[PDB]
Ligand binder design. Structure first.
Ligand code: NAD
Ligand code: NAD
Lengths: 348, 353
């Protein structure tokens, strides 16, 4: 009968009441379970996303990301990547919303912020992959790109690895200099370091940049620690990549969603037959993976809508428990299903 | 900064304030103008829609339909086709919503009902096509399928043609028997007739059925009037058609969106090279359909997002005039754009507890 809307105030209230670490852990755990279900064939990857490329102000994309859970509900995330937003408008680069529709009737049942949820599930996905593929004694995290995603990359990874420090870089000096402040709550010490130094000293790296098509790589084609694990998180336009080919070619590479990664991930640079097993496979059999901790690995992360559905369920469970959100009758359900004009009662 | 939400009460208030006839005329005018722009090369057809097919309890589909106006905004209609809804749940078959996103920032700026808007723009499109291709003195309308769309097909067509009566059929007796009451506001007399009589007597027909994949036609190929114009409106799943092949083969056929129609319309049955000029080309230059009023013609209608964007503008102009809708901060816009955790929860009390 009415759409449950959770906007920014309620989302803030969930975080305040649950706690950042606990919320992140719930999302890590949900994703881990969901990916293992996919890996056993009990659930299935989302369809490929689509989007509309926008050339201005600077090149970006607005995308739609559906996922169906048959007999239950459809999730739709709608999300912009607008890399001029922070400096031009004081808005995040990544701006979106997540909707849920009843699978049986089509009715819009819930709608909420996608900005926070996106950042949380993206950190979580890197944590799932890094727990499997990073050495368990990893002490140094490298971050290339210190914008929004970097915050939750650090946070999530601090929950699953014994991180002592983060070596960080961004092409924008103001964005790298403010990272320590944004990261303070994790307790991981931050040091600004050049990409060459990050590549050489990190045990684990996340790359999460707004680099343009034709502007990589964001790390040099260098020698790295033999156990290095990299989460390649930047992803937006077709053509956009962050890692040097010569590094990728000697890595074990696991995509979150192989078809989508081959279009918009690092796997753009590779043949399909060069890809290792997908992340869900590793989640269903963590022993396919553990043996790969000690050699070079890359998690090619594009994000996919099932992750959004799961993250949304975490928020919906917490909100329901606290009676958060409002109810809005958005869709018109006529008094007679066969009469679009049965709008009664008319106001005044 | 916040999303403008026009929900069910506000859409109702627009209909009440503007009136059903005027609202539909505005939408007719707006679609005509926009289609002409496409026909002139000033604007472009929407990308092909996407969807997720769903088999139970009866096969339907949930679709997304984007249309971008570069530098201004992106419209997205999300809409379900679920043809067990009226009998099982008392909900319309077609259920959806229309959203607008700022093209520059990606921000969700507006969200509104898509149920009414869809019915209105779908009637309007048949009026646009029928004003071009039906005889101006058409008096008898036929309707095959007398569900929700059939109401606005009659309404819209009554506004552009001197209709005196409607001959109507549905496979569900209860649905064809309630059509007179739902149509009464148009003034057009309604009589139930079988499809063969409709085919023989109508000057203009609209087909808007929930017929299943592969289970057409819904109208037989038997002795039609020479000048008949048909709006083929049913469209959901790939494989769904309503008209007989033999009829289409001898008609002048115009699609609203050729590539889309070739996928989901009657044009599934035809080759691309056998289509007439698309509807946009006819709106840009009505002479491209010179003479076709007096011979067999088919408008193959599937719907496309630009139509929703134009209908949505009509509603937003009316709702802005009357200060309608609510404003809801749905998207999180952290004070520091690079800090997803820069949230602002309500402040805790200062005073001793
Ligand atoms: N994998 C996923 O699931 C997923 C989800 C959300 C976002 N993303 C992607 O992550 C990327 C970053 O998003 P964000 O929200 O952090 O954006 P952001 O604008 O907040 O941060 C991006 C940072 O990258 C920096 N940068 C640009 N080019 C660089 C380079 N060559 N080297 C180092 N730094 C550079 C920018 O100055 C900026 O600080 C985008 O590509 C986005 O689409 C991926
Ligand atoms: N072209 C467009 O732009 C557009 C837009 C909206 C809806 N549609 C489509 O129009 C069709 C009707 O939608 P609606 O909202 O009116 O649905 P509805 O369920 O309200 O009505 C459809 C009617 O078709 C009847 N029917 C089923 N099979 C039939 C047959 N063989 N002969 C006669 N009647 C039959 C049903 O009993 C029902 O009364 C659907 O395919 C829908 O997806 C098209």
């Amino acid at each position: 009968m009415e759409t449950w809307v959770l906007g920014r105030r309620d989302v803030a209230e969930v975080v305040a009441a649950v706690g950042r670490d606990e919320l992140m852990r719930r999302i890590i755990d949900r994703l881990t379970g969901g990916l293992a279900e996919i890996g056993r064939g009990e659930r299935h990857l989302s369809p490929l996303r689509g989007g509309l490329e926008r050339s201005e102000p600077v090149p970006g994309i607005w995308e739609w990301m559906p996922h169906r859970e048959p007999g239950d509900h459809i999730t739709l995330k709608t999300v912009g990547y607008s890399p001029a937003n922070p400096a031009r408008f004081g808005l995040p680069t990544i701006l979106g919303t997540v909707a849920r529709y009843d699978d049986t009737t089509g009715a819009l049942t819930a709608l909420m912020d996608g900005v926070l949820l996106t950042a949380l599930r993206t950190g979580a996905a890197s944590a799932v992959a890094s727990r499997l593929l990073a050495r368990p004694d990893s002490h140094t995290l490298g971050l290339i790109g210190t914008g929004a995603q970097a915050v939750t990359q650090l946070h999530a990874l601090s929950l699953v690895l014994p991180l002592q420090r983060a070596l960080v870089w961004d092409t924008d000096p103001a964005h790298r200099e403010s990272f320590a402040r944004r990261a303070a709550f994790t307790g991981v010490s931050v040091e600004i370091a050049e990409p060459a130094r990050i590549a050489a000293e990190a045990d684990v790296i996340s790359t999460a940049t707004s680099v343009a098509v034709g502007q990589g790589p964001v790390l040099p084609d260098t020698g790295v620690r033999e156990h290095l694990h990299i989460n390649a998180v930047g992803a937006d336009l077709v053509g956009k990549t962050e890692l040097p080919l010569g590094l990728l070619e000697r890595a074990f590479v696991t995509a979150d969603h192989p078809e989508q990664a081959l279009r918009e991930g690092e796997c753009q640079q590779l043949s399909a037959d060069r890809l290792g097993p997908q992340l869900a496979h590793l989640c269903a059999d963590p022993a396919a993976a553990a043996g790969r901790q000690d050699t070079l690995s890359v998690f090619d992360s594009t994000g996919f809508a099932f992750e959004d559905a799961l993250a949304m369920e975490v928020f919906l469970e917490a909100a329901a428990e606290r009676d958060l959100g409002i109810r809005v009758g958005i869709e018109h359900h006529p008094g007679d299903a066969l009469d679009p004009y049965a709008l009664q009662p008319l106001p005044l």
